[PDB]
Each structure stands twice: as C-alpha cells, then as structure tokens.
C-alpha cells in the first residue's frame, strides 16, 4: 500500500464560500478534527453528492501500485493488482503547484500551506505535519476520499 503523505478525518464547515456556487464542481471549505489543519477543495458534486453535515475521510498518497513509482502515467485499465487504495469512493490524480508558508523569520518555517491541482480542480491545505510530504513536483499526488463516515 502507498506510503501515506497525509491522513485525516475532516468535517465540513461550509459547501459554498462566497456562496457564488456552480454546477458539477463545488468548492468545499473544511476543517480537520485535529483542529490544526485547514482545507479548501473542489469536488465533482455531480458524481459525489456531498452534504453540509457530512464527515469525510481524506488520504493523500505518493503512489498506488504499492511502493514503487507510477510515473509512467498511462492509466492502464488492464492492471488488477489489489495494491490499490481502491476501497475509497472518490479518487483524484494531480500535481502540486505551490507550497507556501512564512519562512522569513527566525527559524520560522513554522505553519505551512500546500496548493494542489487535480486537473483544474484546485486544493489548498494548511498544516505543519505535512512538511515532509508537500513538494512542488510533477504530476504524482493522489487524493483519495472515502466513505463520508457516519
């Protein structure tokens, strides 16, 4: 199984920030139950009906096919290796474009934000625990969303 970059169970604060709202894609505003990490994320609401009262599980991984790399691209439907984080209801693939915190100060390098792009569906995370896993790198990172819990 993929080396876990980030893992948490999130609660939805709001589904429409500014409220402007649109079709198929919707911008969630969320907060992690650790209450030390923040999240802003687009999801395809047309194929994954989110609710304001819903409590989601989110995972971030650097790979799927277990441990070796997958930078081949070419989604390859013919694979069948149960290595996959396939048990999850919603999965996205994408690239990181910015990451992003105060570092000018003494020591600083404290509290951190990551910006991710999943083919034009944007994501933003704030933290400090993901400091070893956020990188402005080529198309490699996957967002797995599951269950929406209970």
């Amino acid at each position: 199984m993929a080396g876990i970059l980030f893992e948490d169970i999130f609660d939805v604060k709001d589904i429409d920030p500014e409220g402007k709202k649109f079709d198929r894609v919707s911008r969630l505003h969320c907060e992690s139950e650790s209450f030390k990490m923040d999240l802003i994320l687009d999801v395809n609401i047309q194929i994954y009906p989110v609710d304001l009262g819903d409590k989601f599980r989110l995972v971030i991984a650097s790979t799927l096919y277990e441990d070796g790399t997958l930078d081949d691209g070419e989604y390859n439907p013919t694979d069948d290796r149960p290595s996959r984080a396939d048990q999850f209801e919603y999965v996205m693939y994408g690239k990181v474009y910015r990451i992003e915190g105060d570092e000018t100060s003494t020591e600083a390098a404290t509290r951190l934000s990551a910006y991710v792009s999943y083919g034009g569906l944007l994501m933003r995370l704030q933290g400090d625990a993901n400091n070893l896993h956020g990188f402005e790198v080529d198309s490699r990172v996957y967002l797995l969303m599951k269950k929406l819990a209970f």
Partner: protein, 51 residues
C-alpha cells in the same frame, strides 16, 4: 549608480520598457527544469554570479 541614471532616463517613472530576452521567463525556466527546491539551500557562490 545605475538606479540614479535610470531615474534620469525615465522622469515620468514608468516601469515598463521593451527589451530582448525575457529574463524573468528564463530564470523561471531554470527553476522548472533543474527542479530547484525553493526551500532547500541553494548551491551557488555569489562571486561566481557577479563575475
């Protein structure tokens, strides 16, 4: 000294001039191709740059 001369060149104080070779876009290409990490310490001695 260059800054002082440059004020005399553009008394109206506009920042926008036509020049060859987009230096910001090239530098931006250097970061993107060499995969330079903005957080990791750079491996470059300043005197090499000046020379």
């Amino acid at each position: 000294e260059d800054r002082e001369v440059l004020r005399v060149i553009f008394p109206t104080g506009d920042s926008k001039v036509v020049l060859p070779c987009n230096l910001l876009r090239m530098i931006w290409n250097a970061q993107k191709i060499f995969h330079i990490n903005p957080r990791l310490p750079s491996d470059l001695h300043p005197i090499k740059v000046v020379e």
